[PDB]
Amino acid sequence: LQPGFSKTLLGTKLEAKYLCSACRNVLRRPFQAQCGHRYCSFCLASILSSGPQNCAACVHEGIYEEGISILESSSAFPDNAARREVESLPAVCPSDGCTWKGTLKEYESCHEGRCPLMLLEHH
Ligand SMILES: [Zn+2]
Ligand SMILES: [Zn+2]
Ligand SMILES: [Zn+2]
């Protein structure tokens, strides 16, 4: 139930600003809500499946503000600056035993869903 990328991908380079406000994993196709908090596209869509919702991150961080801290489709946008930054980070496959290495973007487009440890049962 974790849409975001396993924190294992970044390893020691793991940073808080690269994490989804919802699943707490590395941002996957990030959107930025009106309040500034980032969410994986999948995570935000799920949260907003039944309409607007209060931003849990705003609450927990004690900065909740009426109106601005409300997650809404009309005020959330693709955070391409965040996406580009995260895609440029050095990454290693999360599969315990895999040696694949490259940028997170290369992981998403070339390795994810094509991992030997996951697809080859006799590995
Ligand atoms: Zn997420
Ligand atoms: Zn927020
Ligand atoms: Zn792998």
User: What is the Å distance from ligand 2's center to 123 Cα?
Assistant: 43
Homologous superfamily, domain 1-123: Zinc/RING finger domain, C3HC4 (zinc finger) (3.30.40.10)
For every residue of the chain, which 3-state class applies, written as one string? CCCCECHHHCHHHCCHHHECCCCCCECCCEEECCCCCEEEHHHHHHHHHHCCEECHHHHHCCCCCCCCCEECHHHCEECHHHHHHHHCCEEECCCCCCCCEEEHHHHHHHHCCCCHHHHCCCC
Q: Which residues surround ligand 1, an ion (CB under 5 A)?
A: 3-4, 20, 22-23, 40, 43
Q: Nearest ligand, CA of residue 44? A: 1
Cα 89 to Cα 30: distance, rounded to the nearest angstrom: 15
User: How many whole angstroms from its chain centre is CA 80?
Assistant: 13
Q: The tokens 């996957």 sit on which residue?
A: 28
How many residues does the structure list for the chain? 123
Of the bound ligands, which one is closest to the alpha carbon of residue 22? 1
Q: In angstroms, what is the resolution?
A: 1.9
Q: How far is the CA of 65 from the centre of ligand 3 (A)?
A: 42
Q: How far is the CA of 54 from the CAs of 48, 74, 93, in angstroms? A: 10, 14, 34
Task: Give the ligand at the shortest distance from the Cα of 114.
Answer: 3
| Ligand 3 centroid to residue 95 C-alpha, Å | 5
